[PDB]
Amino acid sequence: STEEFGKILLKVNQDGSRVLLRDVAKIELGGENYDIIAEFNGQPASGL
Amino acid sequence: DLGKKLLEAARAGRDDEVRILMANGADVNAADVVGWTPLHLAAYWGHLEIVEVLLKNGADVNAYDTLGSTPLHLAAHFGHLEIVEVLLKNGADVNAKDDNGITPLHLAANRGHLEIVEVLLKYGADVNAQDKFGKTAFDISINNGNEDLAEILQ
Numbered sequence: 001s002t003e004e005f006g007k008i009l010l011k012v013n014q015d016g017s018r019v020l021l022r023d024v025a026k027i028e029l030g031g032e033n034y035d036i037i038a039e040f041n042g043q044p045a046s047g048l
Numbered sequence: 049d050l051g052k053k054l055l056e057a058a059r060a061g062r063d064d065e066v067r068i069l070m071a072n073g074a075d076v077n078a079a080d081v082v083g084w085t086p087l088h089l090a091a092y093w094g095h096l097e098i099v100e101v102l103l104k105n106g107a108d109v110n111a112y113d114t115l116g117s118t119p120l121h122l123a124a125h126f127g128h129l130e131i132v133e134v135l136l137k138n139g140a141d142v143n144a145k146d147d148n149g150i151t152p153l154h155l156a157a158n159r160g161h162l163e164i165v166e167v168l169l170k171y172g173a174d175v176n177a178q179d180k181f182g183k184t185a186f187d188i189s190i191n192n193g194n195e196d197l198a199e200i201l202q
Contacts, residue, residue, distance in 0.1 A: 007191055018191075022193070
């Protein structure tokens, strides 16, 4: 899940605070490539 | 011999087979290779009706496996709200610790079971309880990102 990736520990500071992956990056499910965008009769659609 | 058949009857959810084995005098605290009694298997797989039959025939509610895990740890970690209520009713240790210092409250907090955390806390769960790494149930909620759970833990 995205929640599990967000809580990835990158480093622990001198004051005890933790730096997680969600503190330096946005974690979300998204396509491998955002190049192809298909539309059927104007409405958003996919294809094969 | 009879205790081995009871372990398989409690795991497969065969409610009719359990009562027949109980009549023949099967061991209610019979443990397998990993130390799991029939109550551990009933709470792990989620057989509420078998948990009630086992506890009625004098099963050990605070029984622990080869790693100190009790049937309450298994019922809280896998989201079995009905089984947690039945176990706590029969005198289960809400602050039971395994070989890692992990209590059933820690297991219910990591899996986001907000219903089980409320039942555990109602029975007297220690909010400041720490495992071998010094992590409390609140430390898990802030690390996982559960704002609803951190609210209940103050």
